[PDB]
Amino acid sequence: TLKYICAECSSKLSLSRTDAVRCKDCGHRILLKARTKRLVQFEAR
Amino acid sequence: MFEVPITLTNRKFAQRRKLKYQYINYISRRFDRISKKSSDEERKFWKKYEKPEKSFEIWRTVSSQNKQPINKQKMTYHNFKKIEKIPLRKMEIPLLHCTKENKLYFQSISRGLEPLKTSTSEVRNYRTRHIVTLTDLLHLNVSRHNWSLAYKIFATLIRIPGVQIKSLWGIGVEILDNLSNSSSGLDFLQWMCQIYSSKSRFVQNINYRSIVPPFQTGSRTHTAKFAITYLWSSLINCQKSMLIDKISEWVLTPPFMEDAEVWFIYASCHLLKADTLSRQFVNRDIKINQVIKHIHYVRTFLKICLDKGGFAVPSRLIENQLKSFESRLY
Amino acid sequence: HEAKLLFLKSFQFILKRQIRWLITEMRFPKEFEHVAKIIWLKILKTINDQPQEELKLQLHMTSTISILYLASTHLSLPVYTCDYIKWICTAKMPYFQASEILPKSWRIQLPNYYVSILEGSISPFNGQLYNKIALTCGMIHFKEFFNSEISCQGLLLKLVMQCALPPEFYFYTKQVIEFEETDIRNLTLWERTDERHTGRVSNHAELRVLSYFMLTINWMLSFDRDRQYPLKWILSLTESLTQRTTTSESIGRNIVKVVYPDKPTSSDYFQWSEEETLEFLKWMEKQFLPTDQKIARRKLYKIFPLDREANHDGEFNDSTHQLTFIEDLQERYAKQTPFFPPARKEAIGRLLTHIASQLLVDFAISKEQLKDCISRIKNACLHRMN
Amino acid sequence: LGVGVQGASLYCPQENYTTKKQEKPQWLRPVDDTLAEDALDLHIVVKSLLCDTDAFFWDPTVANRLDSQYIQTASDLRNYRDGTEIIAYASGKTGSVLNLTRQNTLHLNRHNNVTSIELHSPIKSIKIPGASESIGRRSNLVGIITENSFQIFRIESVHSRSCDVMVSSSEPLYFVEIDDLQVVDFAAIIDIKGNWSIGRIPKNFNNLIDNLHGTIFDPEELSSWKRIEWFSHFQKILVFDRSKMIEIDFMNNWQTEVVQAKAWSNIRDYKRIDDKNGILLTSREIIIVGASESNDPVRRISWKHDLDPDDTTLRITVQKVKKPDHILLVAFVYSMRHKRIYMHVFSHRKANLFQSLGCSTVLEIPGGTPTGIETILTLDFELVVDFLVKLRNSSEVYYYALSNTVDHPEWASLFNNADEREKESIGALVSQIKLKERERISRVQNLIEHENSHDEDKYLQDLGYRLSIATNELLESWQKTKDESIHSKLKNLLENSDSFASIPEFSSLLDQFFQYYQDQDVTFIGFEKLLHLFLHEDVPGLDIFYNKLLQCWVLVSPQAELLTKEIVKDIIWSLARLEKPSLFEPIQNEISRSLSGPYQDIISSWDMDD
Amino acid sequence: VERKVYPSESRQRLTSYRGKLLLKLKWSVNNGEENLFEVRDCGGLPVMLQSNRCHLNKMSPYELVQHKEESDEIGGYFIVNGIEKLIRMLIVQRRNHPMAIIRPSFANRGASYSHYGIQIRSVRPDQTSQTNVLHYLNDGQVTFRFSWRKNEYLVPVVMILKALCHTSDRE
Numbered sequence A: 001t002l003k004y005i006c007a008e009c010s011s012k013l014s015l016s017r018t019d020a021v022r023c024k025d026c027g028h029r030i031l032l033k034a035r036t037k038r039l040v041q042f043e044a045r
Numbered sequence B: 001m002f003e004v005p006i007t008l009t010n011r012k013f014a015q016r017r018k019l020k021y022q023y024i025n026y027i028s029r030r031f032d033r034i035s036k037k038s039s040d041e042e043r044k045f046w047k048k049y050e051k052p053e054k055s056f057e058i059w060r061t062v063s064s065q066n067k068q069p070i071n072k073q074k075m076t077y078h079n080f081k082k083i084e085k086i087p088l089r090k091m092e093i094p095l096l097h098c099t100k101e102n103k104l105y106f107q108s109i110s111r112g113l114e115p116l117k118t119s120t121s122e123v124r125n126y127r128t129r130h131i132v133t134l135t136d137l138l139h140l141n142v143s144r145h146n147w148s149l150a151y152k153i154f155a156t157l158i159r160i161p162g163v164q165i166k167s168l169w170g171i172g173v174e175i176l177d178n179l180s181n182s183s184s185g186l187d188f189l190q191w192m193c194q195i196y197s198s199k200s201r202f203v204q205n206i207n208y209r210s211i212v213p214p215f216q217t218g219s220r221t222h223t224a225k226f227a228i229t230y231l232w233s234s235l236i237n238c239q240k241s242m243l244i245d246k247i248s249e250w251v252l253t254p255p256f257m258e259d260a261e262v263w264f265i266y267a268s269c270h271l272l273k274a275d276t277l278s279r280q281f282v283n284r285d286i287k288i289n290q291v292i293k294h295i296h297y298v299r300t301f302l303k304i305c306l307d308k309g310g311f312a313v314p315s316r317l318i319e320n321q322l323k324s325f326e327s328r329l330y
Numbered sequence C: 001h002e003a004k005l006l007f008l009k010s011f012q013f014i015l016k017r018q019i020r021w022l023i024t025e026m027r028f029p030k031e032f033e034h035v036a037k038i039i040w041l042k043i044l045k046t047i048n049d050q051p052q053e054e055l056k057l058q059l060h061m062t063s064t065i066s067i068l069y070l071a072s073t074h075l076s077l078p079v080y081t082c083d084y085i086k087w088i089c090t091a092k093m094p095y096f097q098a099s100e101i102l103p104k105s106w107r108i109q110l111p112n113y114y115v116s117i118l119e120g121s122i123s124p125f126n127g128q129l130y131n132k133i134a135l136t137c138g139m140i141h142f143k144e145f146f147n148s149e150i151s152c153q154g155l156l157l158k159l160v161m162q163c164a165l166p167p168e169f170y171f172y173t174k175q176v177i178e179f180e181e182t183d184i185r186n187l188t189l190w191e192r193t194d195e196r197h198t199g200r201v202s203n204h205a206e207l208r209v210l211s212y213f214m215l216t217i218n219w220m221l222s223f224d225r226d227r228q229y230p231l232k233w234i235l236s237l238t239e240s241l242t243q244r245t246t247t248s249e250s251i252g253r254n255i256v257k258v259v260y261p262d263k264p265t266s267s268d269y270f271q272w273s274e275e276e277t278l279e280f281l282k283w284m285e286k287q288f289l290p291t292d293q294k295i296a297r298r299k300l301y302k303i304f305p306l307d308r309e310a311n312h313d314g315e316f317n318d319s320t321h322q323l324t325f326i327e328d329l330q331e332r333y334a335k336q337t338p339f340f341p342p343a344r345k346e347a348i349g350r351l352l353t354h355i356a357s358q359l360l361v362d363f364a365i366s367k368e369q370l371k372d373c374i375s376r377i378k379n380a381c382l383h384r385m386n
Numbered sequence D: 001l002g003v004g005v006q007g008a009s010l011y012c013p014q015e016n017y018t019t020k021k022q023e024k025p026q027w028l029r030p031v032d033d034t035l036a037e038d039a040l041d042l043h044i045v046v047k048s049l050l051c052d053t054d055a056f057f058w059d060p061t062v063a064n065r066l067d068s069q070y071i072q073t074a075s076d077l078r079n080y081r082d083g084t085e086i087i088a089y090a091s092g093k094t095g096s097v098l099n100l101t102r103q104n105t106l107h108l109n110r111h112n113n114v115t116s117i118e119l120h121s122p123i124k125s126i127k128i129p130g131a132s133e134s135i136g137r138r139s140n141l142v143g144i145i146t147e148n149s150f151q152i153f154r155i156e157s158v159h160s161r162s163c164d165v166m167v168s169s170s171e172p173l174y175f176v177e178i179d180d181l182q183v184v185d186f187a188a189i190i191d192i193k194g195n196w197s198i199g200r201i202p203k204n205f206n207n208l209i210d211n212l213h214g215t216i217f218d219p220e221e222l223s224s225w226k227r228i229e230w231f232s233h234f235q236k237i238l239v240f241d242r243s244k245m246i247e248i249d250f251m252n253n254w255q256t257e258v259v260q261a262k263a264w265s266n267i268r269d270y271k272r273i274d275d276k277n278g279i280l281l282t283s284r285e286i287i288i289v290g291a292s293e294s295n296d297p298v299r300r301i302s303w304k305h306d307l308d309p310d311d312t313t314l315r316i317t318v319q320k321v322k323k324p325d326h327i328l329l330v331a332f333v334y335s336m337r338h339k340r341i342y343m344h345v346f347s348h349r350k351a352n353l354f355q356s357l358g359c360s361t362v363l364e365i366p367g368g369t370p371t372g373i374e375t376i377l378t379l380d381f382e383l384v385v386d387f388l389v390k391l392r393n394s395s396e397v398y399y400y401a402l403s404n405t406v407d408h409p410e411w412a413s414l415f416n417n418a419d420e421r422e423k424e425s426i427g428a429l430v431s432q433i434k435l436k437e438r439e440r441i442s443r444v445q446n447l448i449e450h451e452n453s454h455d456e457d458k459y460l461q462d463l464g465y466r467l468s469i470a471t472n473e474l475l476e477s478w479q480k481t482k483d484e485s486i487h488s489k490l491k492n493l494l495e496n497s498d499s500f501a502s503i504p505e506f507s508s509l510l511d512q513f514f515q516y517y518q519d520q521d522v523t524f525i526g527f528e529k530l531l532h533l534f535l536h537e538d539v540p541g542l543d544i545f546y547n548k549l550l551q552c553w554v555l556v557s558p559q560a561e562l563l564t565k566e567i568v569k570d571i572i573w574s575l576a577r578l579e580k581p582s583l584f585e586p587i588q589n590e591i592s593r594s595l596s597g598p599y600q601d602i603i604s605s606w607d608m609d610d
Numbered sequence E: 001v002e003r004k005v006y007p008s009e010s011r012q013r014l015t016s017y018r019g020k021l022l023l024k025l026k027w028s029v030n031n032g033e034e035n036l037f038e039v040r041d042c043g044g045l046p047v048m049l050q051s052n053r054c055h056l057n058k059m060s061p062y063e064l065v066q067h068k069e070e071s072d073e074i075g076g077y078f079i080v081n082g083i084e085k086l087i088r089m090l091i092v093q094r095r096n097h098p099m100a101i102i103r104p105s106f107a108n109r110g111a112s113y114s115h116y117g118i119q120i121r122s123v124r125p126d127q128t129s130q131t132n133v134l135h136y137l138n139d140g141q142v143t144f145r146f147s148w149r150k151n152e153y154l155v156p157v158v159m160i161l162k163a164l165c166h167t168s169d170r171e
């Protein structure tokens, strides 16, 4: 399920559009996106 | 029976003071020519008097130059039966606008006759009707000293929409006086002094309803009566705990540059501190000049407390308090 | 002209919830849905009879109870307006706070004065529940299609057990009824589409049953040459009747004293007791389920948890906290055992205030409304025989 | 001497805290927290009977109509005899007449001769002004205020051989200035509406206003409330209204306004405590204990408590309690409209330091509303106090001593007429049931002697035979009159409907009556899941609905059985709704009226939606 | 509600880590016949990290981890629009001391001057500075220099030494 992470309290918010940019547990206007499961490859040396 | 925490409004109550204060505006302006000769109508009225902003009654000191000659020219029945016919003849046309009770409401109270009827006796809303139920049962277990039942009245009074700032912290002792498995009381005042505490200015020109500057505000030039309560409390909790420096930062953090009462409790943070530090388990380098900070601090903070307005401290006695620790220190 | 149908789209949907509550919980039959739908759809034709140009449809929360009372007498049910005002003011069927929680999608486009009327603003008072019934039987003809037969036997079995009187008054009243009655059966339910004026005849059927219960209880006690009803038993009736108890009927009756603000014996809450204030607040739990500066409110209830902080009544609780309505009477009837003048009639007058004010709160009328109902039964029982 | 004050005000409101601490390190509760600690202190009455005789407003120009305090007359001064206890109140028809000895409680004396003096006007104020303790005696005179005059008497020469209270009088000064005077105090010094004066108290009854006075007429004071008191005898009067306090030294040209109470509180009551320093004031929302300043006798304001009720007709009376350590001052706020009470504690100690302990409240009498509570000095941790009440619309002045350890007149006017003509015309209806009950004490007894008989087994099959007859007619009458698109009686029989009482078999008559109608065109209701509306409980069956109404009228019913069997069938024969037209009747009719309505109302006519 | 702001946050907002300036005025009219005291808001001037005003002030290294800073938090630097702009230290003349420098730039100040002068750097105890220089004319007179607002002013020292205190010529 598509979500995020809160900066201060680590609450995995899930934002829809036309929402306030705050977090739901702490009114903290800074919020960092997390990762989903996606497939990426790499080399090695 | 008690006072109720509702911002209630009805059209007849909005009329009956506009029907009241308008006639007061005329009879005072009618008085303005009689005392000289020998669009709200409430906002216009309050531009003569000061709402007290600190008290229910703006007290004035009498032991000053506030003297006055006594007017021995009495207001007899002659000068009063002639002064009142000209606004009351003029007042008949808003009387035919108001309802049939308000024409009898104004004209009865125009000759004395204070009304008996309660303004909250006809609210009828099934929920405000349940507000007045559980605010008269709230006190009635407090005044009968039953807390663990009045705890459950108050847990269901906060959750009704429409309750005010008043009853929240006025009987907040129910957490405090419980102490059995309680939240120790102080945690609620921390919640109080955060979110209702402003630094706004008292504009005085709006006519205030359901909030009152004696107890439930937190603006400038009136410290919040739940905040200084929170200041006097946790230091007694500090006094009960024998952490001291936390409030001695938390009063240090605001420069309340208006009053005197915050300075003495701020001075009392050092005076209470300097007792146990003046024990030392005597019967020697750090703990001699350590107390002499706090001995010095109170003589400054009380000195600036006394520079402020009327706040009579025992300025003789408090110096003799900490001087006893100098004998313990020496 | 517009959004008056928007009211109509949910004024049935709330009435859908009033009745499905009665069906699923209070065992009311599935036919009660369909009896009301004839009653429901006919007033829409009356609105359709009204021109759409300035229709001004007359629907109130007093209507949705009045059309729910008429479906109870066509089905001939022992539920009444005392068994409705005790199931609405006790927050059981959604009469109160209906605008705010019922639609949840149809709410927002409704205007401000329309959404005001649809919630449970006040409770009905002084025949406002009755005059709408008078306006309901008249506007849509519940008369001459249905049976407007008030089953008065299903009404006064209650009134015996309300105040714990011996069952002789069930038949003592009945022959006072069957003496003074046009057409012996069928106290007539009244219809009025005529005009907006309350005719001071007191033609409501349930209204007049109570005056028969008022005039009997004085006559069977003041004129007692038979010395079967002694004065000391009356001294053990009103002293055992004016006595609080904590059954759910009584607790529910305590809510009814609260809601009415006009009359005295409404500030009766000062005399509440030890056990009474517990369940009154456990009832108040069933008001909040009807009824960005928001995590502060979340922070508020972390220090006021609604349950008790310890030793609550949850699981290892009791034998019985609260006893049932068949068991308080086993303490009332097993109390006033002695069974075999200026001060006799005064001890009857103790009950005259007491039972006629207890009646007066159960049916939402004033003392002047019962003043009409005694002065048009007693002055009409005399004129027939004299 | 505590710390957190102002010099203009000082507060200790409801349930927060003090505002002061000395931090005294003396191991003796190291604080001067302005809430002293103790246990509970509840109050229990000692009830007695002492003496006796527009609906939306009340008038402020009345003060009281009773006063009673220990007094000392001129025959008691020269004599050793000291301590005489009087009582005086207004009563009679128009209230225009004015009229003792504690033995263990206060009672009227045995000689019981109240001097019922007559006047020409109803009484609005009755007071005896009390004694300043710098005189040694107690003043032997009474002040009253009428609508038409102002009389002063003088309690002269009480007796022990007669227990008489005879008076002298002053000349009744009328209204040369025709305005209703409000408050008199002596401590003829009066206060008219808008102005006050100093009048001459006489020593001669065998036969006026001094030239110094003032006016107080606030132009925006719509009410009619005034109040005046001397402030610590030093010729300084405290002049009140509902809004402000005006202090006037009449000795010099010295006037200063102190209180200003127009914004959120207004002055209600002001009882001058007999303590000439400690004095009490009551506005709305707050109790003020504003005393006298020690050095400059102008005005002290001190520790004060918020008044939790919010009302418009507030009053107070204050009674001093003197103990060894301290003084107490209970504060009794009462109201004209409600009955209940509210009381304080103030520990007025010696060094101008005092505290409080809390507030409490007690109960009252179910007839009347209070208008005046009157205290008793009682000649002088189990706090004791005593007071006598006066109720509005109740003329029974009782007594109380609190310590630590309704047939209305609207009911006799409606019933019980005294016409000799219709004294007995109702009485035949009274004897109608005297006939008909004992008619039915035997008609039911026709059934009682038969116990599971075979003629009543014959009658039950005779009964249910007749139910299948008249029903099956109307079922086809419902079928012939089907297409109407535009009822349930079961009382058509008239044989007896009363000669069979067997409840456990009558249900099996009605199960068979439902078994005989299994098809459509007829439906019924249940009887086990619908009978719960009478009792609000589980009704498990028709067999044991009876068993809990059989045990419901045991001790009230003579013979206990015949009254109970005849109501149960009476319910079934009036909950006899067995004649419903079946499901094909509303399905063809509900949509019919909806087809009369257009597509605007089809979607509006929709159930089963969410 | 008002909460404490840590410097871990205004890095992320990329605005300054400002602090409210409180500054109370005075309105003494007519030799102070009426006084008016108004604590006015003045905006946000920023706060050095681990200053008094910073919220890491007496903050432990376990409690410096738990507010997203360094466990050996250095402090000293500002945050201006997200950028850690500290203030470089200078070198000025040692105060409280009259230096007696010769400089050919003193000869660039007019006729009759020389390259001889006394340059003192006078501070005030609020850490101001006021450099007074005493040039030497060849014609025997000595003049006193200062720099008031934007300019340079020249007065003889007989004006000054008479005006400090009442002394005669021999003293």
Ligand SMILES: [Zn+2]
Binding pocket: A006, A007, A008, A009, A010, A011, A023, A024, A025, A026, A027, A028
């Ligand atoms: Zn968060």
